[PDB]
């Protein structure tokens, strides 16, 4: 696959990047004679997250791990505007549709090339692309089928970008709502299900209500007084309560504002 020329430089030393016949990247370590789906630098970042296991409040612990991941991916440099420009240019607008590894790589390369021309040596493109691809497949393609839904890719990138919190909420709600701005239970379940994979991938889903988000959908609709559909304003008001399935996001913003 042509992208191998480009991304093979994301690894060095005794590591070697390889492609399974299914098109999925994996990493060979000739020193230890092993193979792993995770990029060695992703593994190193994850091992390090154990130094946050002392943090007492789970929403804060999760936000700090996600903040560290955000910075390792350079997604704290990414505005909502620029993320949308890359999504637009790659025609990623049918949210129920699949994108394979090459479409993920292409869209991430447009994002990271632009960040790189805007920032001085902060962005190693091949490395960023490969590591962000690795995070996105770990969140959304655990069995390495080689595809993820467009809505999933947007949920990951937008949730970790540097936009203001309400802009993220508005954007994300718009991705699941109908063309007239309306969200019913099924559609909200779509967003919460994609969002909850993020803390679930860090092994912290038990502090966010568990991996079944149906109880949170019902809670949102009961909060909306059992109306059949909701609009963006009501969803923002519900998020102001920091529902348990999503509280890691607002806390992430507080972690970032607190500096580190």
């Amino acid at each position: 696959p042509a992208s191998q020329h480009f991304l093979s430089t994301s690894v060095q030393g005794p590591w070697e990047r390889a492609i399974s016949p299914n098109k999925v990247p994996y990493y060979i370590n000739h020193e230890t004679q092993t193979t792993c789906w995770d990029h060695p630098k992703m593994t190193e970042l994850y091992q390090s997250l154990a130094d946050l296991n002392n943090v007492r409040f789970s929403a804060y612990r999760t936000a700090m791990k996600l903040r560290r991941l955000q910075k390792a991916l350079c997604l704290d440099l990414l505005s909502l505007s620029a993320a949308c420009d890359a999504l637009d240019q790659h025609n990623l607008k049918q949210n129920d549709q699949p994108m394979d590894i090459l479409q993920i790589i292409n869209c991430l390369t447009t994002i990271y090339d632009r960040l790189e021309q805007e920032h001085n040596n902060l962005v190693n493109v091949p490395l960023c692309v490969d590591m962000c691809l690795n995070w996105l497949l770990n969140v959304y393609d655990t069995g390495r089928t080689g595809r993820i839904r467009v809505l999933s890719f947007k949920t990951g990138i937008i949730s970790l970008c540097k936009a203001h919190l309400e802009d993220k909420y508005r954007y994300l709600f718009k991705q699941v709502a109908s063309s007239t701005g309306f969200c019913d239970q099924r559609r909200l379940g779509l967003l919460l299900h994609d969002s909850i994979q993020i803390p679930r991938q860090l092994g912290e889903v038990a502090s966010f209500g568990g991996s079944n988000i149906e109880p949170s959908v019902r809670s949102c609709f009961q909060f909306a007084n059992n109306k059949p559909e909701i609009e963006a304003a009501l969803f923002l008001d519900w998020m102001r309560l920091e529902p348990q399935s999503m509280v890691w996001l607002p806390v992430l913003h507080r972690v970032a504002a607190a500096e580190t």
């Binding site: 399974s20 999925v24 004679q33 193979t35 792993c36 655990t142």
Partner: peptide, 13 residues
């Protein structure tokens, strides 16, 4: 679903 986890190709010298 089912086979949410699978190993990568085995090491080959």
């Amino acid at each position: 679903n089912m086979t949410p986890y699978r190993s990568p190709p085995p090491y080959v010298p």
